[PDB]
mmCIF file of N, CA, C and O in Angstrom:
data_model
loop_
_atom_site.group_PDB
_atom_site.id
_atom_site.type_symbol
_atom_site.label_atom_id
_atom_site.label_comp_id
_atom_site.label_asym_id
_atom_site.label_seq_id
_atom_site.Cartn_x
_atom_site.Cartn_y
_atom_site.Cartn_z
ATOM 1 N N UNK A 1 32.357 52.899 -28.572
ATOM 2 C CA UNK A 1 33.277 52.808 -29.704
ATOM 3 C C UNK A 1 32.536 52.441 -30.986
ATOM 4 O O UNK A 1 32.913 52.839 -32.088
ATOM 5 N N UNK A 2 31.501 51.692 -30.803
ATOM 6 C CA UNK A 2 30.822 51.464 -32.256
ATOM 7 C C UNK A 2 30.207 51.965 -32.958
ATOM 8 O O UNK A 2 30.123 51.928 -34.186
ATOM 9 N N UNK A 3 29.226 53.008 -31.455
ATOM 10 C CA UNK A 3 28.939 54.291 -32.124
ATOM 11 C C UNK A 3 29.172 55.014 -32.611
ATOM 12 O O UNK A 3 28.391 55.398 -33.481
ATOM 13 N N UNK A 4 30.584 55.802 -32.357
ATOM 14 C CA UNK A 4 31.109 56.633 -32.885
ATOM 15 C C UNK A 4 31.870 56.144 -34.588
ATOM 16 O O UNK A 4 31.920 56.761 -35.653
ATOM 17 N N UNK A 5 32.252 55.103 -34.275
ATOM 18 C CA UNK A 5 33.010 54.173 -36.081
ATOM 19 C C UNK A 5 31.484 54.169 -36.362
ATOM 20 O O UNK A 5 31.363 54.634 -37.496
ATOM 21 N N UNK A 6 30.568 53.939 -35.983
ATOM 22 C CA UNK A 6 29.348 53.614 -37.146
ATOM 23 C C UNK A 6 28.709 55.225 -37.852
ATOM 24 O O UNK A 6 28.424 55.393 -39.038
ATOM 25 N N UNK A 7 28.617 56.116 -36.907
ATOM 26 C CA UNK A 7 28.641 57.821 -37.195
ATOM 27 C C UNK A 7 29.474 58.495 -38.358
ATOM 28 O O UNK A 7 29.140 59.164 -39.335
ATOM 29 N N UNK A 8 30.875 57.989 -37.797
ATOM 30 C CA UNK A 8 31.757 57.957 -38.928
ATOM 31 C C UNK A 8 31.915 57.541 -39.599
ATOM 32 O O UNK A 8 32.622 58.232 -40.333
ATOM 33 N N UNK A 9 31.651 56.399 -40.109
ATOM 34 C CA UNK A 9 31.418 55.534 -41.528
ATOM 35 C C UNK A 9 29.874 56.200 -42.048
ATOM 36 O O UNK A 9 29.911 56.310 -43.274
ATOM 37 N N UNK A 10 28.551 56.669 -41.484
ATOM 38 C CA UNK A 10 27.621 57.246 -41.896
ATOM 39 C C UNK A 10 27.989 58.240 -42.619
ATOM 40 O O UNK A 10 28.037 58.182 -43.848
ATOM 41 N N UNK A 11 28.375 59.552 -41.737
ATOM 42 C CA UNK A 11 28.502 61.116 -42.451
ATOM 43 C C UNK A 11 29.996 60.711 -43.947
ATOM 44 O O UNK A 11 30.228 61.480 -44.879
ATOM 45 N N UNK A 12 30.703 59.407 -43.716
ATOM 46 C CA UNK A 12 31.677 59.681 -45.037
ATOM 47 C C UNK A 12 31.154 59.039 -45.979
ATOM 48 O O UNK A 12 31.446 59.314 -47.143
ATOM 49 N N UNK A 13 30.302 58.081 -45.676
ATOM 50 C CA UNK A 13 29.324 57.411 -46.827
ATOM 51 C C UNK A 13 28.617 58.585 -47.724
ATOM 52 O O UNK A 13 28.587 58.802 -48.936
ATOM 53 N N UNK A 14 28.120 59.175 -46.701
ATOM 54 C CA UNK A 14 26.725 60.292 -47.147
ATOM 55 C C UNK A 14 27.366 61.556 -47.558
ATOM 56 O O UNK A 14 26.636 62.414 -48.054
ATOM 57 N N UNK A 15 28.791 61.825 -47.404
ATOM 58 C CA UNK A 15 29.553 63.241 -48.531
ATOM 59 C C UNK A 15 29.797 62.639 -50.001
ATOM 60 O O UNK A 15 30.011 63.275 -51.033
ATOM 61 N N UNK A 16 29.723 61.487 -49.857
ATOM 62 C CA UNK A 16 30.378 60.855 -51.095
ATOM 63 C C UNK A 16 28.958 60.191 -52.182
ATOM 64 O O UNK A 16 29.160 59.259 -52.961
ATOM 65 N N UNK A 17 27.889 60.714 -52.068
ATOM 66 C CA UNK A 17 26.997 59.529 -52.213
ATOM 67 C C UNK A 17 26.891 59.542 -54.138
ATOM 68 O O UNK A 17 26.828 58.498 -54.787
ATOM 69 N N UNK A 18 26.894 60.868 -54.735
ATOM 70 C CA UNK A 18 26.745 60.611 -56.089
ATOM 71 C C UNK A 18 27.807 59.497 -56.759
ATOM 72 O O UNK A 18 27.569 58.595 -57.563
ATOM 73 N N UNK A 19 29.055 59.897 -56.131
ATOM 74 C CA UNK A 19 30.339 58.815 -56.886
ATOM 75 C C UNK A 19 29.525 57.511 -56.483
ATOM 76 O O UNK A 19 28.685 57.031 -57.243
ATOM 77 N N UNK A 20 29.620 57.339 -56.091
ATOM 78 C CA UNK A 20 28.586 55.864 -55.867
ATOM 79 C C UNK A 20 27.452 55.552 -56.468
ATOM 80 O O UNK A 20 26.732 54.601 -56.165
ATOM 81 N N UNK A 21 27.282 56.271 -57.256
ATOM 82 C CA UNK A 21 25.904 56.435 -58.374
ATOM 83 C C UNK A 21 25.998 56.747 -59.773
ATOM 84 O O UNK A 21 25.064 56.754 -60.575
ATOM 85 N N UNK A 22 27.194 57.003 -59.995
ATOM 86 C CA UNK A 22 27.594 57.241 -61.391
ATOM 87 C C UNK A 22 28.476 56.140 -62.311
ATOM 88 O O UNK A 22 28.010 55.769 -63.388
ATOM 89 N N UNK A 23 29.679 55.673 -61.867
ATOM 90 C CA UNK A 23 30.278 55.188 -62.156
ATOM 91 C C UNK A 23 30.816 54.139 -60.686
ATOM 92 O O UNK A 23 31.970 54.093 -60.260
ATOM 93 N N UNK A 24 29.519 53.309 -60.075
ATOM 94 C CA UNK A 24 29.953 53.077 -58.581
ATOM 95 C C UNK A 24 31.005 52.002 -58.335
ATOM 96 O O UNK A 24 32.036 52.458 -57.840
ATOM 97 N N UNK A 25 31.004 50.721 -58.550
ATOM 98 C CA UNK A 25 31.665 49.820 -57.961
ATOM 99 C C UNK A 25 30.867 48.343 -58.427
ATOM 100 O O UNK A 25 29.706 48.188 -58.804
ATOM 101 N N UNK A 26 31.743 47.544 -58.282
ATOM 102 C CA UNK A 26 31.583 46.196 -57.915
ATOM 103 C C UNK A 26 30.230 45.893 -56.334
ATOM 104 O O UNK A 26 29.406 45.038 -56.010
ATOM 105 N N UNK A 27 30.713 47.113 -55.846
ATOM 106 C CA UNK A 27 29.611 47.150 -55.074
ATOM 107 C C UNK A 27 28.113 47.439 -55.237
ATOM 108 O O UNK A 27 27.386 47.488 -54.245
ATOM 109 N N UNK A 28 27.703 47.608 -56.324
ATOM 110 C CA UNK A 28 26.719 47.793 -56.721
ATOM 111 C C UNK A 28 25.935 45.985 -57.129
ATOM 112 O O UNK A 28 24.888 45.470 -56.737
ATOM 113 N N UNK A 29 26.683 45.637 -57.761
ATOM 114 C CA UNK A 29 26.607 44.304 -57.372
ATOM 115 C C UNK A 29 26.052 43.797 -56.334
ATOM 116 O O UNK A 29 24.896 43.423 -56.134
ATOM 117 N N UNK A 30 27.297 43.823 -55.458
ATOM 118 C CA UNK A 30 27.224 43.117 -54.068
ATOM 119 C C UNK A 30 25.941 43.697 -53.247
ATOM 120 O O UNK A 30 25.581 43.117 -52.223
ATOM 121 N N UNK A 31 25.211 44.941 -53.755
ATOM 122 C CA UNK A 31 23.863 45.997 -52.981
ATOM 123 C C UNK A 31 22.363 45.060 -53.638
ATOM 124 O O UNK A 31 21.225 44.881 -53.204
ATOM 125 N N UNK A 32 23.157 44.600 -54.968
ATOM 126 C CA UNK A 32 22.262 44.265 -56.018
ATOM 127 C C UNK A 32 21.803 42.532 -55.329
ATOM 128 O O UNK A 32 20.670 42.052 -55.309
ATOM 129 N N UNK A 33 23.005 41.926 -54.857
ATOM 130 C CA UNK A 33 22.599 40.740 -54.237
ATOM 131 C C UNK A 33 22.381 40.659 -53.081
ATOM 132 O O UNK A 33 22.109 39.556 -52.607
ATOM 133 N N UNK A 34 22.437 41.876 -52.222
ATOM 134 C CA UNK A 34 21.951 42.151 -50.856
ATOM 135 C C UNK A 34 20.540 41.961 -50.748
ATOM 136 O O UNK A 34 19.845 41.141 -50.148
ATOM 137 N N UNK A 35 20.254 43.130 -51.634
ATOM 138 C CA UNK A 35 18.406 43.383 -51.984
ATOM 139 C C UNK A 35 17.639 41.933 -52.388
ATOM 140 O O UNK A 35 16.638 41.490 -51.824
ATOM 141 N N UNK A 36 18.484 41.208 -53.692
ATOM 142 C CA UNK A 36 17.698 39.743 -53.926
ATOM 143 C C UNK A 36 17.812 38.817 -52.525
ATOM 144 O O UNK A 36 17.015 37.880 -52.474
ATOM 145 N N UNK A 37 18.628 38.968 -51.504
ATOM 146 C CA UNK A 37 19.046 37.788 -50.357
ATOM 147 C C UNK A 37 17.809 38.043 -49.062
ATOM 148 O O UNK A 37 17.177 37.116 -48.555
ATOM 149 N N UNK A 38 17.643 39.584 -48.668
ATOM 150 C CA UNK A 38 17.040 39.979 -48.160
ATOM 151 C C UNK A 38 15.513 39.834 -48.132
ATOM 152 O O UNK A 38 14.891 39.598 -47.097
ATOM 153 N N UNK A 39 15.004 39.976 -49.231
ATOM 154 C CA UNK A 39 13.658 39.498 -49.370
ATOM 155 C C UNK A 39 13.116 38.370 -48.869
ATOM 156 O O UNK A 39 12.253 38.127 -48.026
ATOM 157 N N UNK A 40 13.871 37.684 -49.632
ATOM 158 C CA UNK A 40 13.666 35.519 -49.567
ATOM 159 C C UNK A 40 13.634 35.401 -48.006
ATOM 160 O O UNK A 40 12.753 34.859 -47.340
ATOM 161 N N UNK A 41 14.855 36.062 -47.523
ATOM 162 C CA UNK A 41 15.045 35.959 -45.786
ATOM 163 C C UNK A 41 14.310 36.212 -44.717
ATOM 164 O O UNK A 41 14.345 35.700 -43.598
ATOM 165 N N UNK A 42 13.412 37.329 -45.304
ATOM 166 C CA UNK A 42 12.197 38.080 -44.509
ATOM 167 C C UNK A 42 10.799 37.094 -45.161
ATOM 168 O O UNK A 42 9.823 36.947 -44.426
ATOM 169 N N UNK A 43 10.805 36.570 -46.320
ATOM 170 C CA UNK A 43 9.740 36.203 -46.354
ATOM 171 C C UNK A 43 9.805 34.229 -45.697
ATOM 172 O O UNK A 43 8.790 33.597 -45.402
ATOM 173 N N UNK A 44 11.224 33.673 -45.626
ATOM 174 C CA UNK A 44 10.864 32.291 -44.926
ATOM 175 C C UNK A 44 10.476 32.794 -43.189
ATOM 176 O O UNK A 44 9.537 32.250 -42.609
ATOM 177 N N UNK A 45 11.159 33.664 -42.632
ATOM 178 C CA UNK A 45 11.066 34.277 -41.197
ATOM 179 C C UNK A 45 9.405 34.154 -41.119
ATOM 180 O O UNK A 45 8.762 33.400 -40.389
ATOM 181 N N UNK A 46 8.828 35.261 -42.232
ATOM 182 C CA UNK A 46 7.397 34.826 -41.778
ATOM 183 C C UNK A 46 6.687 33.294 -41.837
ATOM 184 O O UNK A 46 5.972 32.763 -40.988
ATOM 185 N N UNK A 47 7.095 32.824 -43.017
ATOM 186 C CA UNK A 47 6.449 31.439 -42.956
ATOM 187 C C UNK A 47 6.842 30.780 -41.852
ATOM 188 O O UNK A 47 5.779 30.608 -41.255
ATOM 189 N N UNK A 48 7.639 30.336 -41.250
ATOM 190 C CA UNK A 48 8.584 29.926 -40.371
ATOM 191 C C UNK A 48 7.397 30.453 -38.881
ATOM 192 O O UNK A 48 6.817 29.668 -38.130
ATOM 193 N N UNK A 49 7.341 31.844 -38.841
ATOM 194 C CA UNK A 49 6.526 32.308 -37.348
ATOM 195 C C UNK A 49 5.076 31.389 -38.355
ATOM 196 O O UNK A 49 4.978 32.055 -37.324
ATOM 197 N N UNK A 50 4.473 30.987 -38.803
ATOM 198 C CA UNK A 50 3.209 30.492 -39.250
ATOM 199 C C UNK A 50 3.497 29.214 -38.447
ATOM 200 O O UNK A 50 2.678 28.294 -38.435
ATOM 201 N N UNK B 1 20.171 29.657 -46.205
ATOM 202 C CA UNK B 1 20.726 28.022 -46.755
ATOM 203 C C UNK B 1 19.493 27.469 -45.030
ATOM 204 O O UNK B 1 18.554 26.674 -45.086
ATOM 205 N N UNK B 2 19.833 27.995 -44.139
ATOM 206 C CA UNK B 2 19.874 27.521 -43.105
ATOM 207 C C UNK B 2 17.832 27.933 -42.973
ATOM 208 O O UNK B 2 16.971 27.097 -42.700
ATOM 209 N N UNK B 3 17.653 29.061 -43.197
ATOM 210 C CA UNK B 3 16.325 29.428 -43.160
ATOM 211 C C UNK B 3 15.200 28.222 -43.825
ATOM 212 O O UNK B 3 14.146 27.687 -43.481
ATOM 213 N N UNK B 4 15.973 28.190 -44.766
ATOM 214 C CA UNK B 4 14.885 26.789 -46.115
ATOM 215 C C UNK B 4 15.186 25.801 -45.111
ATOM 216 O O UNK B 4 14.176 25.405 -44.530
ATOM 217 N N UNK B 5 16.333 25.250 -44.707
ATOM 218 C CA UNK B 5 15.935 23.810 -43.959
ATOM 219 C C UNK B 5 15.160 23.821 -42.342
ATOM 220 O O UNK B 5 14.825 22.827 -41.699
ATOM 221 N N UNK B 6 15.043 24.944 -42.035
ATOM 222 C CA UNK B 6 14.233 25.078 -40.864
ATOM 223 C C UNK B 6 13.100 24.672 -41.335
ATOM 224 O O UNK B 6 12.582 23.622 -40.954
ATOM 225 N N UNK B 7 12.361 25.775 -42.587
ATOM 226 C CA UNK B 7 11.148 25.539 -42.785
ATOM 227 C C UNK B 7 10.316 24.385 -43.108
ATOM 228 O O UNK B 7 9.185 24.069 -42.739
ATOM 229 N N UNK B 8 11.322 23.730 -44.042
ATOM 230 C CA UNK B 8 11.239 22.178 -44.530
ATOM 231 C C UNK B 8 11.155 21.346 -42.864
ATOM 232 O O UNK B 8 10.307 20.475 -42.669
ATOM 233 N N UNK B 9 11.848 21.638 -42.098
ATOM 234 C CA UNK B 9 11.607 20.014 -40.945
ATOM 235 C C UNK B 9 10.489 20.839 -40.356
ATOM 236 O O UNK B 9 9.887 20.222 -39.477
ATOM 237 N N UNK B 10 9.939 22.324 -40.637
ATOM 238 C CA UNK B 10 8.967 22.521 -39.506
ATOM 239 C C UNK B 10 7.717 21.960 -40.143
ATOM 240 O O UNK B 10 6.985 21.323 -39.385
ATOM 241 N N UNK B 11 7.343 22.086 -41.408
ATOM 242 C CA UNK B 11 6.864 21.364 -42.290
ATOM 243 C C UNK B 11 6.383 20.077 -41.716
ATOM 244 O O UNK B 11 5.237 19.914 -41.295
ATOM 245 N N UNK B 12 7.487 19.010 -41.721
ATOM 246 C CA UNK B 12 7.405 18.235 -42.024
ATOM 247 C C UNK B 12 7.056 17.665 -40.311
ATOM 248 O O UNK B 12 6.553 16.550 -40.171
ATOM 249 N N UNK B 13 7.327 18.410 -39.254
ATOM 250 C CA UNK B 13 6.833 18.224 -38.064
ATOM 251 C C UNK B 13 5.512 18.649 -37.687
ATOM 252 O O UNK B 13 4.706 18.171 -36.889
ATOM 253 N N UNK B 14 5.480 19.398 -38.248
ATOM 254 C CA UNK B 14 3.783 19.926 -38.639
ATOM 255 C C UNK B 14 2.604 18.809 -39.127
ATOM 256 O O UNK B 14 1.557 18.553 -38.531
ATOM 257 N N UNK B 15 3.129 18.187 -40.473
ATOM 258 C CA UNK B 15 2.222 17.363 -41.182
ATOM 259 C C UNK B 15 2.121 15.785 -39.893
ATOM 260 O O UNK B 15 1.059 15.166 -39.840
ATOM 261 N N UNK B 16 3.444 15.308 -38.904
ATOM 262 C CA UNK B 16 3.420 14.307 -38.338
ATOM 263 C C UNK B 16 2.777 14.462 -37.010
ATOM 264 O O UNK B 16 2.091 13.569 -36.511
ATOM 265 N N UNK B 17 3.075 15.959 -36.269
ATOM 266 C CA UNK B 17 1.929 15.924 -35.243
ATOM 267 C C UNK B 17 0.499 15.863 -35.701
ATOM 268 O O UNK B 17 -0.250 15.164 -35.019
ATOM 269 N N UNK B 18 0.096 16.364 -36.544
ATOM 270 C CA UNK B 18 -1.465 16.470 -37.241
ATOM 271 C C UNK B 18 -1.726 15.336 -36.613
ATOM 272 O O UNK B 18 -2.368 15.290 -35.563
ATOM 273 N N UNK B 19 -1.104 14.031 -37.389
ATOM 274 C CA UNK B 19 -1.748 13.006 -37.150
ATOM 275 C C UNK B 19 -1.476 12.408 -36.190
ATOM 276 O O UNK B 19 -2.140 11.378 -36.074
ATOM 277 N N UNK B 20 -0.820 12.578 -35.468
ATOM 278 C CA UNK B 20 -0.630 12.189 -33.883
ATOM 279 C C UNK B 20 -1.450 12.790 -33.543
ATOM 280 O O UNK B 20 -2.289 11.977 -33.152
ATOM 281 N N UNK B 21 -1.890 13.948 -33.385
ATOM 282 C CA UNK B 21 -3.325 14.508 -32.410
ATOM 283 C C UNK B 21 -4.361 13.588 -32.794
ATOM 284 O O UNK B 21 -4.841 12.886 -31.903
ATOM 285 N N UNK B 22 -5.035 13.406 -34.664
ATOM 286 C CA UNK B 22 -5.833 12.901 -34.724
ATOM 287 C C UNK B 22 -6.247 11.361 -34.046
ATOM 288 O O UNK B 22 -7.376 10.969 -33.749
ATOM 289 N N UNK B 23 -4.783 10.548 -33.893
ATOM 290 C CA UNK B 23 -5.101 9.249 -33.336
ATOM 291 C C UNK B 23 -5.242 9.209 -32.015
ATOM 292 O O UNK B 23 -5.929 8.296 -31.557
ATOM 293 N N UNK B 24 -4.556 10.299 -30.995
ATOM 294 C CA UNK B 24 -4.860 10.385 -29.935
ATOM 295 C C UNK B 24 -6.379 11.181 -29.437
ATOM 296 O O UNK B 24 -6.725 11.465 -28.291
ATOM 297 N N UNK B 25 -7.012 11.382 -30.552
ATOM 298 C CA UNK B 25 -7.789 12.183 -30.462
ATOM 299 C C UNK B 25 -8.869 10.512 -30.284
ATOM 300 O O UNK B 25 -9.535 10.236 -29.286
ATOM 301 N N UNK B 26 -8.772 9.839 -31.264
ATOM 302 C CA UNK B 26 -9.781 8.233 -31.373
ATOM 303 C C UNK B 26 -9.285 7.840 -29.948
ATOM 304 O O UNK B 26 -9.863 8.079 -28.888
ATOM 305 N N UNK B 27 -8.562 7.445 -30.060
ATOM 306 C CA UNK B 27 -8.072 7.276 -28.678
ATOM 307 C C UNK B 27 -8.476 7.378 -27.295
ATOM 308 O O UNK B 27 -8.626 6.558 -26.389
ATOM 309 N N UNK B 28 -8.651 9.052 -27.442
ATOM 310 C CA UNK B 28 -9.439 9.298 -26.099
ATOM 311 C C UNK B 28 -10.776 8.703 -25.960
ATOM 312 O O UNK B 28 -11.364 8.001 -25.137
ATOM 313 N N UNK B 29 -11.160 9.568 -27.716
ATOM 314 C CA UNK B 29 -12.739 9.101 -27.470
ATOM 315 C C UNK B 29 -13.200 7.645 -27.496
ATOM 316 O O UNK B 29 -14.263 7.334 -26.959
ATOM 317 N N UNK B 30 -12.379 6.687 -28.147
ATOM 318 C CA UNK B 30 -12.891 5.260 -27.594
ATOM 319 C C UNK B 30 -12.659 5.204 -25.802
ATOM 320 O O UNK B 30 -13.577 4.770 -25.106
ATOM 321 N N UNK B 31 -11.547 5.614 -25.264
ATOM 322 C CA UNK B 31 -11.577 5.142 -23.782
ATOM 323 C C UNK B 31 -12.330 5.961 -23.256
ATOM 324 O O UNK B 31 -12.506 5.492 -22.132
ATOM 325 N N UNK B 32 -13.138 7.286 -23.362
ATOM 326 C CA UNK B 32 -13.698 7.559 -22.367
ATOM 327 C C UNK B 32 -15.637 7.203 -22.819
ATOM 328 O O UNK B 32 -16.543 7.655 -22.119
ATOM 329 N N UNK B 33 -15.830 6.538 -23.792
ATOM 330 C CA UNK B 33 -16.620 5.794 -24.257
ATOM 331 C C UNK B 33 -16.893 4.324 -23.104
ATOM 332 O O UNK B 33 -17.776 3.871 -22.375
ATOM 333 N N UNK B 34 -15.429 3.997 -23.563
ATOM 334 C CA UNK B 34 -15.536 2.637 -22.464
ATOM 335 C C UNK B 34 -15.517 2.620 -21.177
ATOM 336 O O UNK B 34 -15.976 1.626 -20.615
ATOM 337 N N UNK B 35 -15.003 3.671 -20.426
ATOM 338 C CA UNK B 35 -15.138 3.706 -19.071
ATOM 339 C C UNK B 35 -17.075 4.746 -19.054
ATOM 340 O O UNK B 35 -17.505 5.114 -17.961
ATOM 341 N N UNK B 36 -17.627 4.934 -19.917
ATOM 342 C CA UNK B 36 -18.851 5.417 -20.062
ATOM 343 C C UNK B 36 -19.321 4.095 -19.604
ATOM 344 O O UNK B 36 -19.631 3.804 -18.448
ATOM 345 N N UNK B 37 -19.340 3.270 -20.717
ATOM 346 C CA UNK B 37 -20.281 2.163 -20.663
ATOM 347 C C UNK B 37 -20.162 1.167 -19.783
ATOM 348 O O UNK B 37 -21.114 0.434 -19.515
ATOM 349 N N UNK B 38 -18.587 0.998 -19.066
ATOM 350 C CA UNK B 38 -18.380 0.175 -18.086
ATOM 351 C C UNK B 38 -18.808 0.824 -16.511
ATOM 352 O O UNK B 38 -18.781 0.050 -15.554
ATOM 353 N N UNK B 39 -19.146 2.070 -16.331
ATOM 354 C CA UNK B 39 -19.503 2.871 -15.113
ATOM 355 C C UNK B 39 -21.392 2.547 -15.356
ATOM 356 O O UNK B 39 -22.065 2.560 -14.326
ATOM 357 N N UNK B 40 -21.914 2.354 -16.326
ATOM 358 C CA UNK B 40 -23.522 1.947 -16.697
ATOM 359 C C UNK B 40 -23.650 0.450 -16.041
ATOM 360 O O UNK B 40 -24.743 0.206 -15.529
ATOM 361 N N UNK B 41 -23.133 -0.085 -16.019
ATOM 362 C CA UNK B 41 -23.075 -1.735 -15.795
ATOM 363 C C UNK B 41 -22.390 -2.173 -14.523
ATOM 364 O O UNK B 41 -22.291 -3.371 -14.257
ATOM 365 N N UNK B 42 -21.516 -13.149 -2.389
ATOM 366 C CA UNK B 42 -22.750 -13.688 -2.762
ATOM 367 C C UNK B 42 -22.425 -15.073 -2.974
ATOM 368 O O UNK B 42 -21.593 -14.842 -3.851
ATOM 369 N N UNK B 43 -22.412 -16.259 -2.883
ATOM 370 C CA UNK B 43 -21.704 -17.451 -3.636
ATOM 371 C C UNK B 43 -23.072 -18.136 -3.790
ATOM 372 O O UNK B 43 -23.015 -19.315 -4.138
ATOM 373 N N UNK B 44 -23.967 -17.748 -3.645
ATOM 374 C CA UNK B 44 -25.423 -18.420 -4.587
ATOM 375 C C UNK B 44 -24.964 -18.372 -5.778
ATOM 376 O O UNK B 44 -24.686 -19.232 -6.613
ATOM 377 N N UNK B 45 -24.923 -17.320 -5.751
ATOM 378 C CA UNK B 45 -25.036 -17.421 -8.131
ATOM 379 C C UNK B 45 -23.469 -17.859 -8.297
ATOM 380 O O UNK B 45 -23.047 -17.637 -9.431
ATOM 381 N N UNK B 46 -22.595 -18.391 -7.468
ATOM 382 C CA UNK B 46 -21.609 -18.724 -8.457
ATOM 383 C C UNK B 46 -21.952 -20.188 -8.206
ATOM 384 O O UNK B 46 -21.751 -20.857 -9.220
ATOM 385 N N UNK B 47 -22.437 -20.943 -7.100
ATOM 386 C CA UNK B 47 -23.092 -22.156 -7.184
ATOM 387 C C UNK B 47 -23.535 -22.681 -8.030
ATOM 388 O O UNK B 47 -23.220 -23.672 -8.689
ATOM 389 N N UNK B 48 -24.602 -21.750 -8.041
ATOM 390 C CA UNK B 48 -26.146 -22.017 -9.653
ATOM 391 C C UNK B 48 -25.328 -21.737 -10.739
ATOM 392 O O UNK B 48 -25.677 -22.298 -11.777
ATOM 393 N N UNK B 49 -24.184 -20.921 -10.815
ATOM 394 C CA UNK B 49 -23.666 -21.116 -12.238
ATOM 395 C C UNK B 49 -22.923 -22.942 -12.480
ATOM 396 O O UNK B 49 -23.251 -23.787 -13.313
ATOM 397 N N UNK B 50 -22.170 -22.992 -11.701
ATOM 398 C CA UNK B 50 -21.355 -24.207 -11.402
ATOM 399 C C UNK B 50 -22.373 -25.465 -11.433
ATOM 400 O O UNK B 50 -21.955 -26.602 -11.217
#
């Protein structure tokens, strides 16, 4: 079941992808603080395995 | 939130074993010093002491 909802949330993401690039969302934001959260997260993980 | 305070007590468990190894480290080497020098080294002589 997750496969298939995750397939399907893929291919309707990916017909739609310019609207999401032009005039996108609040979500652009929320992609924008994904990318800054993500980094920091991967880089204590390594210090952390040190 | 949770990543930073890992790193901080690993830190800080880090800097307190250091020096726990180092004192157990004197440690050893005075006792196996002393059982060195103590492994190097009748009622007449307790008479003549008396």
């Amino acid at each position: 079941k997750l496969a298939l909802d995750r397939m399907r949330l893929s291919t309707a993401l990916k017909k739609n992808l310019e609207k999401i690039s032009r005039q996108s969302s609040v979500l652009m934001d929320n992609m924008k603080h994904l990318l800054e959260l993500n980094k920091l997260i991967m880089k204590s993980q390594q210090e952390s395995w040190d | 939130s949770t990543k930073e305070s890992k790193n901080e007590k690993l830190k800080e468990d880090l800097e307190r074993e250091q020096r726990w190894l180092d004192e157990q480290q004197q440690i050893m080497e005075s006792l196996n010093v002393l059982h060195s020098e103590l492994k190097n080294k009748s009622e007449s002589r307790i008479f003549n002491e008396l």
